[PDB]
Design a protein around this ligand. Structure first.
Ligand SMILES: C[S@@+](CC[C@H](N)C(=O)[O-])C[C@H]1O[C@@H](n2cnc3c(N)ncnc32)[C@H](O)[C@@H]1O
Lengths: 37, 262, 128, 224
């Protein structure tokens, strides 16, 4: 999803889905850091 | 635990409506030899509700007199009698689809079914403690209603009236409701979702199909709530817009045409 | 004439069920039936990941996805499965190592042994 | 944004570690033989009933059991939503020679279901009504047009020889007072009722999710 941690931490989501949500969020923070630099 | 003070709440709220006199203008009591072979268009017009209080002769009802299903096709419901309205039929499990098929041959689309869960009177009495006349049956129904705070511990599945049937035990009665749209731009006003599609009734084991008083009143109030302008109020209403077939010979409900098979 | 329902179910799963629904002997593959539909890791997918690590440097997952998975795979799942295969949760030091299929078991055993030695063996993964 | 953003970076590290181990643990349990909630003697089919070779199913059932299905339950996707014609075109005439059909029907498709039972050679003989129950025990009244729908009707038709050794008569109940367990998720009691009707028989479910997989059931679905 996005910066909303509660959406990516849903119990309905499975661990693979949750984990790829965290990895997409990680990519977003990396992109924001690259935009900062 | 079973919430029967709420499932059977209506048995403490709804009162039987008093029967109107035959010499009164609020009822139309008509007597016919055979309802299925009688021109009903002479006994009412522009109907909105037609509740056929049909008691069927089915193999489940052992050695009990009732209407034959094959005669229902002989019934005539012309557009003059009912143009745009709702028809109510007591349905048994072995002649369910046939009824629907018959109702398809007379322009009545299936729109609803109203099901009565049946709670065993003897089972409820045994849970309280541990041929019967209708006065006695009503007496123990009221006794069960009064003693409902101590019956809540018993599971609801042990109270269901599981009567004999070839395939699945009969713990339900059905009132199929059909509609006739008829002409266009003639809107049948309906107050929607004002009655539960399922009800619970404590019944006797011998004849669950023959619905007793205080519960036929539930069906009457469902019909009158579903079709508001079909209710006959004197002064600005020329004709009665409700009519019931095979009605009780002593209880003529006001606002209805009482058709008695005599 | 009773019917052996275990054998009957096994034979029917052999006949009219997917290769992921049942196993080779007809036994019900429970691995398929506790992950979401369309997210199951087949043994063919494991062999494809092993062949992709042999063919391409481990760490570059777009190439593996477009070559040995026909583009229908998750990069996250590929990274997690290579972490399982190497036995180490963090594969940063294994970036583009290009490890062969017949050799990867040695590093898996080495990481598992380091997990026992350093008391970091949490569920068959060297928690470094 | 700004410093707390990389603070979130530490956060998006920490969780992505912990969940990782959790996933690994689950997969490790997958490696060391973890049983699923579905039973062992379940026969799942993952195919669309439009494209599924029913003749293969018929031949497999003939060569593995020697007899056709005894109960065929069905929860059709009424208008993925299959049309009425495509649901009707399903070859239930060949999937059953002597037994019962247990097809669920919403109100809007109540009549056509009675048509389908009539068009498949069955004769409609029963109805089982599932009254939806709330968590407290009350009636789960839904939404309707004429009445507040608080029921789901499963129409039961019968086809042929029933007075044989199987198909116990006068069993169970025609009413299931069970709770609502999910979206379009049928009660489990009907399965028990089916086991009350036909003990240790062969049964078929045409539109079955993963929760409808039971013992001695040949379930069909697309998300199975
Ligand atoms: C009414 S729901 C059935 C729910 C199920 N009986 C339960 O209790 O969980 C319809 C289901 O049928 C399945 N289905 C839909 N379209 C299908 C198709 N074309 N062929 C086979 N199965 C289909 C899907 O799993 C869908 O959720």
């Amino acid at each position: 999803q996005y910066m909303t941690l509660e959406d990516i931490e849903n119990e309905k989501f499975t661990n693979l889905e949750i984990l790829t949500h965290l990895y997409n969020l990680k990519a977003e923070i990396v992109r924001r850091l690259a935009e900062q630099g | 635990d079973n919430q029967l003070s709420l499932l059977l709440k209506w048995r403490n709220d709804k009162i039987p409506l008093k029967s109107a006199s035959e010499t009164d203008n609020k009822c139309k009591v008509v007597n016919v030899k055979n309802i299925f072979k009688s021109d009903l268009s002479k006994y009412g017009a522009n109907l909105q509700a037609l509740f056929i209080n049909a008691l069927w002769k089915v193999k489940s009802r052992k050695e009990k007199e009732g209407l034959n299903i094959n005669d229902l096709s002989n019934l005539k419901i012309p557009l003059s009698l009912m143009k745009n309205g709702i028809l109510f039929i007591w349905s048994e499990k072995e002649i369910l689809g046939q009824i629907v098929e018959i109702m398809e041959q007379k322009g009545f689309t299936y729109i609803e079914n109203f099901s009565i869960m049946f709670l065993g009177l003897n089972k409820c009495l045994q849970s309280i403690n541990h041929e019967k006349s209708i006065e006695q049956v009503t007496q123990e129904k009221k006794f069960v209603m009064n003693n409902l705070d101590i019956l809540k511990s018993t599971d609801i599945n042990n109270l269901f009236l599981r009567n004999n049937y070839p395939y699945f035990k009969k713990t339900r009665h059905t009132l199929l409701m059909f509609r006739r749209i008829g002409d266009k731009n003639q809107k049948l006003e309906l107050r929607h979702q004002r009655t539960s599609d399922v009800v619970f009734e404590v019944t006797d084991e011998q004849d669950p199909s023959k619905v007793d008083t205080m519960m036929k009143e539930y069906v009457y109030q469902m019909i009158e709530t579903l079709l508001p302008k079909a209710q006959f109020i004197p002064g600005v209403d020329k004709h009665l817009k409700m009519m019931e077939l095979f009605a009780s010979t002593d209880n003529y409900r006001p606002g209805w045409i009482s058709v008695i098979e005599k | 004439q009773p019917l052996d329902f275990t054998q009957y179910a096994k034979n029917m799963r052999k006949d009219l069920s997917n290769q992921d629904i049942c196993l080779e002997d007809g036994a019900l593959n429970h691995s398929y039936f506790l992950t979401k539909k369309g997210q199951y890791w087949t043994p063919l997918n494991q062999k494809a990941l092993q062949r992709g690590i042999e063919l391409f440097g481990v760490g570059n997952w777009k190439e593996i996805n477009y070559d040995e998975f026909s583009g229908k795979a998750n990069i996250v799942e590929l990274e997690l499965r290579t972490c399982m295969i190497l036995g180490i949760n963090d594969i940063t030091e294994y970036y583009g190592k290009k490890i062969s299929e017949e050799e990867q078991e040695e590093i898996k055993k080495s990481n598992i042994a380091k997990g026992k030695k350093e008391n970091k063996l949490k569920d068959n993964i060297y928690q470094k | 944004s700004k410093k707390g953003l990389q603070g979130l970076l530490q956060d998006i590290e920490k969780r992505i570690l912990h969940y990782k181990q959790l996933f690994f643990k689950e997969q490790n349990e997958i490696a060391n033989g973890k049983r699923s909630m579905v039973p062992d003697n379940s026969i799942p089919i993952c195919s669309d009933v439009t494209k599924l070779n029913f003749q293969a199913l018929i031949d497999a059932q003939m060569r593995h059991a020697g007899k056709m299905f005894d109960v065929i339950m069905m929860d059709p996707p009424w208008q993925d939503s299959l049309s009425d014609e495509k649901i009707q075109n399903m070859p239930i005439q060949s999937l059953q020679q002597d037994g019962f059909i247990f097809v669920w029907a919403i109100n809007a498709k109540y009549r056509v279901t009675i048509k389908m039972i009539e068009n498949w050679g069955y004769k409609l003989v029963d109805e089982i009504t599932w009254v939806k129950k709330t968590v407290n025990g009350k009636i789960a009244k839904g939404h309707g047009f004429y009445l507040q729908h608080a029921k789901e009707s499963c129409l039961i038709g019968v086809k042929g020889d029933v007075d044989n050794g199987r198909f116990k008569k006068n069993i169970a109940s025609d009413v299931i007072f069970s709770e609502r367990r999910g979206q379009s998720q049928k009660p489990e009691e009907i399965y028990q009722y089916i086991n009350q009707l036909c003990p240790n028989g062969n049964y078929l479910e045409i539109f079955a999710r993963r929760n409808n997989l039971h013992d001695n059931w040949v379930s069909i679905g697309n998300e199975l």
